[PDB]
Amino acid sequence: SLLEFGKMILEETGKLAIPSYSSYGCYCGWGGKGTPKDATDRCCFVHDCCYGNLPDCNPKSDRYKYKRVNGAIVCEKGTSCENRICECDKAAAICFRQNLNTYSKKYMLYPDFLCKGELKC
Ligand SMILES: O=C(O)Cc1c[nH]c2ccccc12
Hints:
It is found in: Secreted. By secondary structure, this protein is mostly helical.
């Protein structure tokens, strides 16, 4: 679920999902179009594609379980949708962590009209 993803993001990065990743660039927090602005935005692009891979799942609301084995996120077994959603979220959270070094506040609340053109998953 969105709230669990948000908790995972905070755990990984020390930033609050809202507002740090809820309106960032072209793909974080609402997705759509455009060339992703930076590596963090590319995490969101891929995450959006990942959810797009699951047309008959409900990633915003369906809850999954995960644990930590040392630092590492381990998605625990639920329904197939839950497992797949968890893997999407885990990847995005890791990606955000890997790209924290280039995160830029100037991309928070990024205006939609600067995001143009379809980029295929
Ligand atoms: O529902 C959405 O697509 C947007 C959304 C609402 N609150 C959020 C918190 C963190 C990340 C995305 C969202």
